[PDB]
Ligand SMILES: Cn1c(=O)[nH]c(=O)c2c1nc(SCCCc1ccc(Cl)cc1)n2Cc1cc(N)cc(Cl)c1
Ligand SMILES: [Mg+2]
C-alpha cells in the first residue's frame with residue numbers, strides 16, 4: 001500500500017525489539033495504531049483468517065484509535081501500538097509459535113490493540129471513590145478492564161463497516177471473543193500475583209521438572225502435551241499480555257525514560273485532582289511535589305517487573321529485554 005515515506009521509514013523494522021515507537025507517533029501525528037496495526041495484522045494474515053476486507057480493518061483500527069484519549073500523557077493510542085508491538089514480538093518467538101494456535105495469535109493481537117480503549121488516565125480506585133458512572137455500571141469490580149472489552153465490542157459489532165468478525169464461523173467467534181475478553185481482563189492490576197504464580201506453578205515448574213529428563217524424543221511429545229492444553233494456553237496468553245502491557249522498563253533506555261515520564265504525569269495528575277476534591281488519596285505517594293521518578297521506577301520494577309519477566313524470560317528466552325531491564329534499573333539507581 002502507498003504509504004507516506006516518512007511513516008513507511010518509521011515502520012521499517014517493526015520485527016525488532018529495538019523500535020522507535022515515538023518517531024512513528026510523530027510521523028503519524030498521533031495515529032500510530034492504524035499504521036502499525038495494518039502492517040502487523042497483514043504480516044500475521046489476520047484478515048485472511050477472519051475473512052475481513054482491508055477496508056473493514058482500516059475502519060476498525062480507526063474507530064479504536066479514535067476512542068483512545070490523545071490528551072492522556074500515557075494511556076493513549078501510542079501505548080496501545082507499543083503494547084501491540086511487544087505482543088507481536090512475543091508471538092514471533094519460537095517457544096510461543098509451537099505452543100499456541102493461530103486463534104490465540106488473533107486473540108492476542110486484537111486484545112493488545114483494545115486492552116486500554118477509552119482509558120481516562122485515572123485508576124480503578126479513583127473511579128470507585130469518585131462514584132464514576134463506570135464504577136456504578138461495573139459495581140466497583142474490574143471497572144476499567146471490563147469497560148475496555150465491552151466498549152471495544154460495542155464499536156466493533158455495532159456497525160457493519162467495523163465488524164471484523166461478521167464473516168466468521170460462529171463457534172470460532174465464540175472462542176475468539178472469550179479469549180479476547182480473558183486477556184483484556186487479565187491486565188487488571190489486582191490480578192497480578194495471582195496470574196504470575198499460576199504461570200510459575202503450572203508452566204515453569206512442571207516444564208523445568210521435565211527438562212531434566214533429557215532430550216528424549218518421547219519427552220518432547222509429553223512436554224507438548226502438557227503445554228498445549230487449553231487451560232495452559234490461557235495461562236500463557238495472560239502472561240504474554242501482562243508482559244507486553246508493562247514492557248516499558250525492558251525497552252531501550254531513551255524509550256524507558258519517556259514511558260516513565262508519561263505514566264508519572266498521569267498519576268501526579270490524579271493526585272492533584274484527589275486533593276482538590278477532598279477525595280481519599282489512593283496511591284498517596286505519586287505526588288508531583290514529593291515523588292522521585294527514578295526511585296518510583298525502581299519500586300515498580302521491584303514489585304511488578306522483576307519476578308514476572310523472570311518467569312517469562314525462562315520460558316521464552318528474551319535476552320534483549322533482560323539486558324535492557326538491567327541497564328535501565330542501573331540508570332535509575334545511578335541518579336543518586
Ligand atoms: C510500565 N510502567 C512503567 O514503566 N513505569 C511506571 O511507573 C508504571 C508503569 N505502568 C504503571 S501503571 C500501568 C497500569 C496499572 C497496572 C499496574 C500494574 C499491573 Cl501488573 C497492571 C496494571 N506505572 C505506574 C506505577 C508505578 C509504581 N511504582 C506502582 C504503581 Cl501501582 C504504578
Ligand atoms: Mg489497562
Ligand SMILES: [Zn+2]
Pocket residue numbers: 079083115116245
Ligand atoms: Zn495498558
